[PDB]
Design a protein around this motif. Structure first.
Motif, mmCIF file in Angstrom:
data_model
loop_
_atom_site.group_PDB
_atom_site.id
_atom_site.type_symbol
_atom_site.label_atom_id
_atom_site.label_comp_id
_atom_site.label_asym_id
_atom_site.label_seq_id
_atom_site.Cartn_x
_atom_site.Cartn_y
_atom_site.Cartn_z
ATOM 1 N N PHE A 192 15.881 -1.891 0.762
ATOM 2 C CA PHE A 192 15.355 -1.173 1.907
ATOM 3 C C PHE A 192 16.436 -0.292 2.500
ATOM 4 N N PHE A 229 0.470 6.665 1.596
ATOM 5 C CA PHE A 229 0.787 5.437 2.296
ATOM 6 C C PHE A 229 0.515 4.220 1.429
ATOM 7 N N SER A 230 -0.628 4.236 0.755
ATOM 8 C CA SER A 230 -1.034 3.150 -0.123
ATOM 9 C C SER A 230 -0.020 3.044 -1.258
ATOM 10 N N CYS A 266 6.883 -0.749 -1.739
ATOM 11 C CA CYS A 266 7.626 -1.624 -0.858
ATOM 12 C C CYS A 266 7.352 -3.083 -1.155
ATOM 13 N N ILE A 278 5.436 -4.811 7.672
ATOM 14 C CA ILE A 278 5.324 -4.412 9.064
ATOM 15 C C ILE A 278 6.669 -4.449 9.764
ATOM 16 N N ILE A 329 8.807 -1.446 8.134
ATOM 17 C CA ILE A 329 8.442 -0.133 8.633
ATOM 18 C C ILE A 329 8.802 0.031 10.099
ATOM 19 N N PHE A 344 -3.291 2.823 9.761
ATOM 20 C CA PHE A 344 -3.073 1.907 10.873
ATOM 21 C C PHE A 344 -4.330 1.749 11.693
ATOM 22 N N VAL A 370 -7.184 -4.739 6.164
ATOM 23 C CA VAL A 370 -7.014 -4.645 4.723
ATOM 24 C C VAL A 370 -8.307 -4.885 3.948
HETATM 25 C C1 LIG Z 1 -2.618 -1.537 9.018
HETATM 26 C C2 LIG Z 1 -2.291 -2.144 7.622
HETATM 27 C C3 LIG Z 1 -2.630 -3.662 7.572
HETATM 28 C C4 LIG Z 1 -3.292 -1.398 6.606
HETATM 29 C C5 LIG Z 1 -2.926 -1.573 5.164
HETATM 30 C C6 LIG Z 1 -1.577 -1.729 4.743
HETATM 31 C C7 LIG Z 1 -1.401 -1.883 3.365
HETATM 32 C C8 LIG Z 1 -0.807 -3.216 2.938
HETATM 33 N N1 LIG Z 1 -0.564 -3.538 1.600
HETATM 34 C C9 LIG Z 1 -0.856 -2.620 0.571
HETATM 35 C C10 LIG Z 1 -0.605 -2.957 -0.819
HETATM 36 C C11 LIG Z 1 -0.953 -1.927 -1.848
HETATM 37 C C12 LIG Z 1 -1.570 -0.550 -1.451
HETATM 38 C C13 LIG Z 1 -1.828 -0.214 -0.013
HETATM 39 C C14 LIG Z 1 -1.495 -1.194 0.975
HETATM 40 C C15 LIG Z 1 -1.742 -0.874 2.341
HETATM 41 C C16 LIG Z 1 -0.403 -1.726 5.769
HETATM 42 C C17 LIG Z 1 1.046 -1.523 5.392
HETATM 43 C C18 LIG Z 1 2.077 -1.539 6.432
HETATM 44 C C19 LIG Z 1 3.440 -1.344 6.116
HETATM 45 O O1 LIG Z 1 4.309 -1.370 7.055
HETATM 46 N N2 LIG Z 1 3.749 -1.117 4.770
HETATM 47 C C20 LIG Z 1 4.816 -0.357 4.315
HETATM 48 C C21 LIG Z 1 6.198 -0.725 4.679
HETATM 49 C C22 LIG Z 1 7.342 0.052 4.218
HETATM 50 C C23 LIG Z 1 7.165 1.250 3.364
HETATM 51 C C24 LIG Z 1 8.393 2.009 2.920
HETATM 52 O O2 LIG Z 1 9.546 1.684 3.489
HETATM 53 O O3 LIG Z 1 8.276 2.959 2.001
HETATM 54 C C25 LIG Z 1 5.755 1.630 2.983
HETATM 55 C C26 LIG Z 1 4.602 0.817 3.472
HETATM 56 C C27 LIG Z 1 1.695 -1.764 7.876
HETATM 57 C C28 LIG Z 1 0.325 -1.958 8.273
HETATM 58 C C29 LIG Z 1 -0.772 -1.944 7.256
#
Ligand SMILES: CC1(C)CCC(c2cnc3ccccc3c2)c2cc(C(=O)Nc3ccc(C(=O)O)cc3)ccc21
Ligand SMILES: CCCCCCCC/C=C\CCCCCCCC(=O)O
Lengths: 232, 217
Positions: A18, A44-45, A51, A86, A89, A118, A211
């Protein structure tokens, strides 16, 4: 002593899985709050998937983690992933800009973070990210809180919960001394930081609820992988 | 002067001061109600609580009453097995829970709370402290002076750890081991709110309203 090596080890595990906000070159992309921005959601996904992979490599780096039944490894990882994402990030939050930065540099603001996924939990996560600022945590502290959070002997379906509780003991000691060494006059900072895990638990709880929602409104959204990734 | 600020003995005192149709829903409701009725009494005896602004006192309680009750009942059941001993004295077996849809919560209380408290022999002082920490929630919404609340929470942190160093010198990490219960108490406490549609406490009278009365009196 042997705690310092533990601390050093965990800081490196974190540093290595990280990058730090202050080291990231940022990049971006008027808009307003909308149910979801699929194109933002796709990035984002993506970043999330990555991550999670990184979080798993982090755990493997944690002393004694691997020497746990593979079932236990998977269980702890499945239970603490959102928690850690969480927390991760949120340690990438720039208050002056009210933004959150990703591991590749992608920097999103509140509305973008909202539209990226979010959704309703937006103001929630952002508030938590703010509550972290006073703690002025550093790499070692974030890594330790992450480990203490992951290596939790409370998780159900644990084969050897006692072994987990044993693994967490040193982490809590390392965090206690390290935190207090850094902030000599504020001893309450150790329980304060520790108790953030409580708030983090509250958020990831609702997080997992969103999720499932998303897993529905988006075809083939978020394939399972810790289980498999860990096995291989 | 750690304890001087937050007298562990004065907390243990509140713990003890408030110390305690037949079916699962009824039993839990009656047990909850009974404890709810004496929660203000309890809180009032927690150092400095009564000194806080009233409108705040109502906010702190309505925010942690569910967690406060689960904490006491959990500790109280350290003795019993495969179940929970309600404040009414009734023993509720997990099979009873699964009968009323709360079987999942139950198992969680049992394994993450009761069984952990038993395993480390959390004494009545410590439990009381944790409850106090749960009382002074600096994040409760609508708080007049959060800083004052967080300050008090920090005092309990200070007292409790002091106490654990005194009474259990051989356990340097007992303090932490203890706090780690709070996270699980919150998880479980949250999941419990989802079942309030079926468990109607205090004659459905809104919680905060009932609390207000209890306090203003
Ligand atoms: C609001 C919520 C619960 C929605 C879905 C989701 C999420 C979680 N797991 C996943 C696994 C695979 C694909 C998408 C995904 C999306 C998710 C993810 C986070 C989060 O900080 N993840 C996150 C943390 C760090 C980085 C980075 O440093 O590059 C990227 C994403 C925070 C809240 C949510
Ligand atoms: C905290 C009371 C919440 C009641 C609704 C939740 C449904 C029941 C689920 C688990 C029961 C936990 C036992 C709590 C009883 C508290 C009163 C007592 O101290 O006997």
């Amino acid at each position: 002593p042997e705690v310092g090596e533990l601390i050093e080890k965990v800081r490196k595990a974190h540093q290595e899985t990280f990058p730090a906000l202050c080291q990231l070159g940022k990049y971006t992309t008027s808009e307003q709050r909308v149910s979801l921005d699929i194109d933002l959601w796709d990035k984002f996904s993506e970043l999330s998937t990555k991550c999670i992979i990184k979080t798993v490599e982090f755990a493997k780096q944690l002393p004694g983690f691997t020497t746990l039944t593979i079932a236990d490894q998977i269980t702890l990882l499945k239970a603490a992933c959102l928690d850690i994402l969480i927390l991760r990030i949120c340690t990438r939050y720039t208050p002056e800009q009210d933004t959150m930065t990703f591991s590749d540099g992608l920097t999103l603001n509140r509305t973008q973070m909202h539209n990226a996924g979010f959704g309703p939990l937006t103001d929630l996560v952002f508030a938590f990210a703010n509550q972290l600022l006073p703690l002025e945590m550093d790499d070692a502290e974030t890594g330790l809180l992450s480990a203490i959070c992951l290596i939790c002997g409370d998780r159900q379906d644990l084969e050897q919960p006692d072994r987990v509780d044993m693994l967490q003991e040193p982490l809590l000691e390392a965090l206690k001394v390290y935190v207090r060494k850094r902030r000599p006059s504020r001893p309450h900072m150790f329980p304060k930081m520790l108790m953030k895990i409580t708030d983090l638990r509250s958020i990831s709880a609702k997080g997992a609820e969103r999720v499932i929602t998303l897993k529905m409104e988006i075809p083939g959204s978020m394939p399972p992988l810790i289980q498999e990734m860990l096995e291989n | 002067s750690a304890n001087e600020d937050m007298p562990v003995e004065k907390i243990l005192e509140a713990e003890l001061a408030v110390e305690p149709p037949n079916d699962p829903v009824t039993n839990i409701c009656q047990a909850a109600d009974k404890q709810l009725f004496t929660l203000v009494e309890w809180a009032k005896r927690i150092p400095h609580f009564s000194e806080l602004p009233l409108d705040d006192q109502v906010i702190l309680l309505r925010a942690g009453w569910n967690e406060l009750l689960i904490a006491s009942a959990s500790h109280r059941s350290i003795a019993v097995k495969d179940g929970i001993l309600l404040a009414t004295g009734l023993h509720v077996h997990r099979n009873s829970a699964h009968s009323a849809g709360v079987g999942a919560i139950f198992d969680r209380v049992l394994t993450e709370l009761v069984s952990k408290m038993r395993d480390m022999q959390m004494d009545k002082t410590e439990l009381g402290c944790l409850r106090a920490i749960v009382l002074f929630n600096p994040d409760s919404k609508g708080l007049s002076n959060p800083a004052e609340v967080e300050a008090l929470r920090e005092k309990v942190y200070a007292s409790l750890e002091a106490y654990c160093k005194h009474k259990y010198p051989e356990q340097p990490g007992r303090f932490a081991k203890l706090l780690l219960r709070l996270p699980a108490l919150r998880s479980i406490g949250l999941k419990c709110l989802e079942h309030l549609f079926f468990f109607k406490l205090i004659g459905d009278t809104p919680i905060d309203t009932f609390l207000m009365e209890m306090l203003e009196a």
